């Protein structure tokens, strides 16, 4: 582990004793998805699990196109539809689905097992499976429901931004399989740049609350949106409106342990200081002299 | 008053409550080991990492079962009464090993009642609060929201749960002669009195009356 | 001499060569994984290698810190007189168990002053060749060379300082009734009279007189 020496998080390890980092001036990359282009077609699901040597099970229509119905072990990203008349016309939003890659990640924060979870410094968050151990705290931790259990081996999978490729110098194959280019890859700031000049054009078209979907309570993300209605995320099939990582786990995940660990090193004290300075509780202490 | 002991516990109690000890051995050490991920020779408390998370839940739903059959046993002898009151009152005092000179002390005293309850308590907590987080069988029933309060109050309930039996279990090594009625179900007349007074009185009582009631 | 204990040790002094075994166990055990790695579990001594190399000498500061309070407030009872020779020409008596037969003994004999220099000066070679050799803090403003030799002296000075405590627990262990007086206090007078005649002589001199001196 740590070989490529650019681990800037890293789960369940201590902060006094941070992960092998010292290469870590590369530039941040993102993706970013224009829903305002796509055009549902499914080939990323199909690019993605044909890329990464996966397959899902042949599943069921139950009255929608979305297929698979969620994300799983076998399913890294899928294509979410919503059909709506709330701004007055009728409307198909369309959205790919999968992890956002957030640049604090609840998942890595929720995670009990030591490297199970880590952060590379250009923003890819990925899972080392030789370090999970299937509990699936992650799955709660994360605010944005992505990571999947695999039950044929109790381990969590999810979107890797094609760590593999981008490690490389090649972009991920979800993002040059597009058809039509509502996907788009490059550097965080860059794509910052893209998405906000996409942003103008839809006002220009009519749309006066587009925006990019880079929310701050995760400390933005690296997989990026640019939605034409960003004052209602909720009309995509559910996407949060600030999105954060929730305040019950930051209490178990932060001040919870060190409270812990001040009582138990307490009470050890005063039961250790208590036994020495009284002495045993013996049925005679009296015929002792 | 003419035998070295008196039979303060029962075979079925004795067995029963060294089998929760041990299970509650692995179960605090494999959760202390998800709590405090640095100390990581625990993650080897069921042999592996990956075995841990499994064996947990179950050897926590054994100490609950056992536990209710416990709380069935000692419940009627736990309940409190105005006569704890003195004993809540000189907890300084009897700490100092002096709790005879100021309190009534019936088969169990007010500290141990309380730590019945604490830990009958914790116990239920825990066996909810453990079914909604486990995966694979359970938590996919529950919404998301619920089971992160449940993962934040099962390591709190825990936590709470293992100071306790850390007290408990000092308590024991602490007023001596204890351990060996745990083992071996017998109290000597003495300690009976010093710890326990009326308790003794009523067994004393019981016994030498009926054995009078016979006739001899 | 109607008493079955003599207090040997004050609670102050008790707390603190307790707290000093507890310190040294996660010290020695730390030491003794850098010195032999193929000991690979000491390695988790602090929870983690990397941990370890951090609290190693914090945790070595504060054992030196709690030796200086022993060190004023023991030394004075194990300074070497003429009447130790007696102790060191019978040694191999000694170890049979027949110490009282061939030597003088006061508050502490003369193996136990000897144990104490020993403690007391590896303890003070491992604080000045640690600071020199702690990273980040102040190996940076040591000359190389004398970071090599302090890397040297540090790593024998500790095996030899755990020899000592191996053999000091030893003694502790073997001259029985002795561990109890250092976590209760006392002492039986019969312990005394054996073990430590001279000192035992005095106590009760001092007692006895100045009880006599009262005006009974
Ligand atoms: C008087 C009151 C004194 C109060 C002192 C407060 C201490 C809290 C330290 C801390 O949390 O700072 C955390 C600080 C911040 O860490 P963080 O990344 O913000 O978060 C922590 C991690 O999230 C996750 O938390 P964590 O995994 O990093 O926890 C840290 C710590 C965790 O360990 C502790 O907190 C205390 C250990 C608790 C033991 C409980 C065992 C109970 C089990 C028994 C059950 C019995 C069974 C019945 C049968 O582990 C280490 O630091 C090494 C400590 C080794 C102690 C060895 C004792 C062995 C004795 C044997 C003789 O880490 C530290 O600086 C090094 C701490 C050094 C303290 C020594
Ligand atoms: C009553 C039955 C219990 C059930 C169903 C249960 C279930 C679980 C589950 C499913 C987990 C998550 C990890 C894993 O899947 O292995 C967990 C974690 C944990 N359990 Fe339990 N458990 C029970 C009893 C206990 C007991 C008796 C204790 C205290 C000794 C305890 C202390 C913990 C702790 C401290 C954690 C980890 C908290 C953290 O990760 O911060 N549990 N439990
Ligand atoms: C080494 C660990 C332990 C020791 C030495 C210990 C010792 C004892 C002793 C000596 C008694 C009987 C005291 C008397 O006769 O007054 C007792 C009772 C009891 N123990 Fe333990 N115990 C240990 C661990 C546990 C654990 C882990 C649990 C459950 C979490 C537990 C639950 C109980 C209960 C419920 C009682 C009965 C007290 C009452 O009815 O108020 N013990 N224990
Ligand atoms: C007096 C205060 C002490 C200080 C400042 C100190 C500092 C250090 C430092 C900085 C190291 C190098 C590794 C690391 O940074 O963690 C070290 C290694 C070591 N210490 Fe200490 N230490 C002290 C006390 C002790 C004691 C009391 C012992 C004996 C139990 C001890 C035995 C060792 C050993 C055996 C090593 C490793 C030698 C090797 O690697 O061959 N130290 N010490
Ligand atoms: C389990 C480990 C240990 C045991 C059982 C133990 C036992 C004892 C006992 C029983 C005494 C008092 C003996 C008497 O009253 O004559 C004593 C004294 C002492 N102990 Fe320990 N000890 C241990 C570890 C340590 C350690 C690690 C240190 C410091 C490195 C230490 C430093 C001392 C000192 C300086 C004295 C006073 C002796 C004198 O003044 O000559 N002990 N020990
Ligand atoms: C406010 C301080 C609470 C003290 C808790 C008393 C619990 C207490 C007191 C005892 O004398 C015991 C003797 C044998 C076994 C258990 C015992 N416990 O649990
Ligand atoms: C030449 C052999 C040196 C023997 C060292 C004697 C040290 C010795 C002898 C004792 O009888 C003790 C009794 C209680 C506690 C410590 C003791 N120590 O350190
Ligand atoms: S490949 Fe592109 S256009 Fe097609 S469904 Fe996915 S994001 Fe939309
Ligand atoms: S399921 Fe795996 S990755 Fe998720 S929190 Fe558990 S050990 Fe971490
Ligand atoms: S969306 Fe979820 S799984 Fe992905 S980085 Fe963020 S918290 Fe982790
Ligand atoms: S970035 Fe790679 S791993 Fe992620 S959805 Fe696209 S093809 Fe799949």
Same mark, same amino acid.
């Given at each position: 582990?740590?070989?490529?020496?650019?681990?800037?998080?890293?789960?369940?390890?201590?902060?006094?004793?941070?992960?092998?980092?010292?290469?870590?001036?590369?530039?941040?990359?993102?993706?970013?998805?224009?829903?305002?282009? #796509?055009?549902? #077609?499914?080939?990323?699901?199909?690019?993605?699990?044909?890329? @990464?040597?996966?397959?899902?099970?042949?599943?069921?229509?139950?009255?929608?196109?979305?297929?698979?119905?969620?994300?799983?072990?076998?399913?890294?990203?899928?294509?979410?539809?919503?059909?709506?008349?709330?701004?007055?016309?009728?409307?198909?939003?369309?959205?790919?689905?999968?992890?956002?890659?957030?640049?604090?990640?609840?998942?890595?924060?929720?995670?009990?097992?030591?490297?199970?979870?880590?952060?590379?410094?250009?923003?890819?968050?990925?899972?080392?499976?030789?370090? #999970?151990?299937?509990?699936?705290? #992650?799955?709660?931790?994360?605010?944005?429901?992505?990571?999947?259990?695999?039950?044929?081996? @109790?381990?969590?999978?999810?979107?890797?931004?094609?760590?593999?490729?981008?490690?490389?110098?090649?972009?991920?194959?979800?993002?040059?399989?597009?058809?039509?280019?509502?996907?788009?890859?490059?550097?965080?700031?860059?794509?910052?740049?893209?998405?906000?000049?996409?942003?103008?054009?839809? *006002?220009?078209?009519?749309?006066?609350?587009?925006?990019?979907?880079?929310?701050?309570?995760?400390?933005?993300?690296?997989?990026?949106?640019?939605?034409?209605?960003?004052?209602?995320?909720?009309?995509?099939?559910?996407?949060? *409106?600030?999105?954060?990582?929730?305040?019950?786990?930051?209490?178990?995940?932060?001040?919870?342990?060190?409270?812990?660990?001040?009582?138990?090193?307490?009470?050890?004290?005063?039961?250790?200081?208590?036994?020495?300075?009284?002495?045993?509780?013996?049925?005679?202490?009296?015929?002792?002299? | 008053?003419?035998?070295?002991?008196?039979?303060?516990?029962?075979?079925?109690?004795?067995?029963?409550?060294?089998?929760?000890?041990?299970?509650?051995? /692995?179960?605090?050490?494999?959760?202390?080991?998800?709590?405090?991920?640095?100390?990581?020779?625990?993650?080897?408390?069921?042999?592996?990492?990956?075995?841990?998370?499994?064996?947990?839940?179950?050897?926590?739903?054994?100490?609950?079962?056992?536990?209710?059959?416990?709380?069935?046993?000692?419940?009627?002898?736990?309940?409190?009464?105005?006569?704890?009151?003195?004993?809540?009152?000189?907890?300084?005092?009897? /700490?100092?090993?002096?709790?005879?000179?100021?309190?009534?002390?019936?088969?169990?005293?007010?500290?141990?009642?309380?730590?019945?309850?604490?830990?009958?308590?914790?116990?239920?907590?825990?066996?909810?609060?453990?079914?909604?987080?486990?995966?694979?069988?359970?938590?996919?029933?529950?919404?998301?929201?619920?089971?992160?309060?449940?993962? /934040?109050?099962?390591?709190?309930?825990?936590?709470?749960?293992?100071?306790?039996?850390?007290?408990?279990?000092?308590?024991?090594?602490?007023?001596?002669?204890?351990?060996?009625?745990?083992?071996?179900?017998?109290?000597?007349?003495?300690?009976?009195?010093?710890?326990?007074?009326?308790?003794?009185?009523?067994?004393?009582?019981?016994?030498?009356?009926?054995?009078?009631?016979?006739?001899?």
């Amino acid at each position: 582990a740590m070989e490529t020496q650019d681990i800037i998080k890293r789960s369940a390890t201590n902060s006094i004793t941070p992960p092998s980092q010292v290469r870590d001036y590369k530039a941040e990359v993102a993706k970013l998805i224009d829903v305002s282009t #796509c055009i549902g #077609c499914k080939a990323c699901q199909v690019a993605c699990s044909e890329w @990464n040597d996966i397959r899902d099970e042949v599943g069921h229509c139950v009255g929608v196109y979305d297929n698979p119905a969620d994300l799983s072990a076998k399913s890294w990203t899928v294509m979410r539809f919503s059909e709506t008349e709330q701004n007055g016309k009728l409307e198909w939003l369309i959205r790919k689905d999968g992890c956002m890659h957030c640049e604090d990640p609840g998942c890595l924060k929720a995670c009990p097992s030591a490297g199970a979870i880590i952060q590379y410094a250009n923003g890819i968050v990925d899972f080392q499976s030789e370090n #999970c151990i299937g509990c699936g705290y #992650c799955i709660a931790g994360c605010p944005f429901n992505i990571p999947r259990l695999n039950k044929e081996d @109790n381990r969590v999978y999810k979107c890797t931004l094609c760590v593999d490729r981008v490690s490389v110098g090649q972009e991920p194959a979800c993002v040059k399989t597009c058809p039509t280019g509502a996907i788009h890859f490059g550097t965080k700031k860059e794509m910052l740049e893209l998405a906000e000049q996409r942003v103008a054009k839809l *006002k220009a078209r009519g749309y006066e609350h587009a925006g990019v979907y880079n929310p701050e309570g995760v400390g933005g993300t690296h997989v990026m949106y640019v939605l034409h209605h960003a004052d209602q995320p909720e009309l995509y099939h559910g996407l949060p *409106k600030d999105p954060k990582i929730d305040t019950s786990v930051s209490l178990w995940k932060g001040a919870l342990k060190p409270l812990a660990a001040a009582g138990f090193i307490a009470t050890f004290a005063g039961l250790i200081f208590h036994y020495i300075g009284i002495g045993p509780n013996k049925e005679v202490d009296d015929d002792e002299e | 008053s003419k035998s070295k002991m008196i039979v303060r516990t029962k075979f079925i109690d004795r067995a029963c409550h060294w089998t929760v000890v041990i299970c509650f051995f /692995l179960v605090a050490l494999s959760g202390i080991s998800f709590f405090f991920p640095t100390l990581q020779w625990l993650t080897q408390t069921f042999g592996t990492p990956q075995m841990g998370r499994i064996l947990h839940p179950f050897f926590g739903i054994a100490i609950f079962v056992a536990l209710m059959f416990m709380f069935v046993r000692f419940v009627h002898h736990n309940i409190p009464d105005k006569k704890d009151i003195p004993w809540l009152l000189n907890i300084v005092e009897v /700490l100092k090993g002096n709790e005879h000179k100021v309190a009534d002390v019936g088969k169990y005293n007010a500290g141990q009642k309380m730590m019945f309850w604490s830990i009958m308590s914790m116990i239920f907590v825990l066996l909810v609060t453990g079914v909604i987080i486990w995966r694979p069988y359970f938590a996919q029933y529950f919404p998301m929201q619920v089971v992160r309060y449940s993962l /934040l109050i099962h390591a709190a309930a825990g936590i709470i749960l293992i100071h306790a039996i850390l007290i408990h279990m000092y308590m024991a090594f602490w007023v001596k002669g204890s351990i060996k009625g745990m083992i071996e179900g017998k109290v000597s007349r003495r300690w009976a009195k010093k710890h326990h007074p009326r308790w003794y009185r009523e067994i004393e009582k019981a016994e030498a009356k009926k054995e009078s009631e016979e006739g001899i």
